[PDB]
Amino acid sequence: MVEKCWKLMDKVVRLCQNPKLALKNSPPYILDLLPDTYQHLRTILSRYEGKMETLGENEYFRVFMENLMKKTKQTISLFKEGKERMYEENSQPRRNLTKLSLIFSHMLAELKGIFPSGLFQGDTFRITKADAAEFWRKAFGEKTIVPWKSFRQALHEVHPISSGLEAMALKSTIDLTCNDYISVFEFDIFTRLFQPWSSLLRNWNSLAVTHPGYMAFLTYDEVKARLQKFIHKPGSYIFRLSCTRLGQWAIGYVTADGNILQTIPHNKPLFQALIDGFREGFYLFPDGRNQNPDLT
Amino acid sequence: SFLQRYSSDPT
């Protein structure tokens, strides 16, 4: 099973080595992520020598390998169908490859979070936000992974979701590995990004649903490329999930001096960074728009 | 090797 995945991963790698892609060495970097995924899968198999029995029963790991196989096939398939439009920056097939790369990066983060040192620890996973942890313990016990419907319904009982369309927006924000399951790890990331728990969904609504600045599934280089058109418009800014520091925010903005910087706010909630940054002239024009949301 | 990435909070 794992042997079949490696051969698929191998092909994506050969596919992504094509010079016409001009792929930058910059996270998420598919040429690193697949070998590193392999290496971490090698590590887990090493820690389960003999007891492959136990590993094979593990629910999370089964979901993970299945998604890994699905994702690599989808990638191979995407190159097949896209042919030379893969090399055209700004093409849809190319954008799909970027987003896959991000999904691979999220998958590896999660696998490392659940198997640190290669040994399964999903059942003693320490959720960061105390209120979030209480919700997950009470609804799912020591479960590592739950189906989406299941997650949706439990969450809805504490934080009502307004509508089907909103539920689907929420699912695509939280489901980083795009596998219709929520992991305790995916859960931890979401509740870190959108804390405080007490107003979770309002927070996510204000920062992501109705915010023109928010950029789902965008990478560092995409933020850089996107803000270039606003290079003469200091104060133009957008923000997104950091890919290398999953659970923290990355705000990109155009400075008065013509630089494009990206920063990770610490020691203050994203709300406060945005309010302060508006107040001080750094974060004025979300995606270059003249009107900035009022987050007060 | 070394390359521009994240920069300290301006706010």
Residue numbers in the entry:
A (entry chain B): 55 to 350
B (entry chain A): 1064 to 1074
Q: From the publication, what sentences describe this entry?
A:
The protein product of the Casitas B-lineage lymphoma (c-Cbl) gene is a multi-domain, multi-functional scaffolding protein with E3-ubiquitin ligase activity that is crucial for regulating cell signaling pathways. c-Cbl regulates cell proliferation, differentiation and morphology in response to growth factors, hormones and cytokines, binding to substrates via its tyrosine-kinase binding motif (TKB) in its N-terminus. The c-Cbl TKB domain consists of three tightly-connected domains: a divergent SH2 domain that binds to the phosphorylated tyrosine; a four-helix bundle (4H) which packs against the SH2 domain and completes the phosphotyrosine binding pocket; and a calcium-binding EF-hand, which wedges between the SH2 and 4H domains. Consistent with other studies, our previous study demonstrated that the pSpry2 and pEGFR peptides interact with c-Cbl TKB through (1) a positively-charged pocket into which the phosphorylated tyrosine inserts and establishes the majority of the hydrogen bonds, and (2) a hydrophobic cluster, which forms significant interactions with the conserved C-terminal proline residue of the bound peptide. We also determined the crystal structure of the doubly phosphorylated EGFR and Spry2 peptides complexed with c-Cbl TKB at 2.2 and 2.1 Å resolutions, respectively, and observed that the phosphate group of the Ser/Thr residue shifts away from the c-Cbl phosphotyrosine binding pocket with minor conformational changes of the peptides in the interacting region.
While there is an abundance of evidence both in vitro and in vivo to show that phosphorylation of Tyr1069 on EGFR is crucial for c-Cbl binding and receptor ubiquitination, it is less-well characterized how phosphorylation of the additional serine residues within the target sequence affects substrate recognition by c-Cbl. Recent work has revealed that both Ser1070 and Ser1071, immediately adjacent to the Tyr1069 are critical for EGFR desensitization, internalization and degradation. Similarly, the additional phosphorylation on EGFR significantly reduced the binding affinity of EGFR to Cbl when compared with the singly phosphorylated EGFR peptide, with 26- and 31-fold decreases for ppEGFR and tpEGFR, respectively. Notably, the difference between the double and triple phosphorylation for EGFR was not considerable, suggesting that phosphorylation at the pY+1 position is predominantly responsible for the decrease in binding affinity. Surprisingly, unlike the phosphate group of the tyrosine residue, which makes six hydrogen bonding contacts with c-Cbl, the phosphate groups of Thr56 and Ser1070 have no interaction with c-Cbl and are both shifted away from the surface. When we analyzed the electrostatic surface potential, the results showed that the region on c-Cbl contacting the pY+1 and pY+2 positions of the peptides is negatively charged, which could repel the high negative charge on the phosphorylated serine or threonine residues.
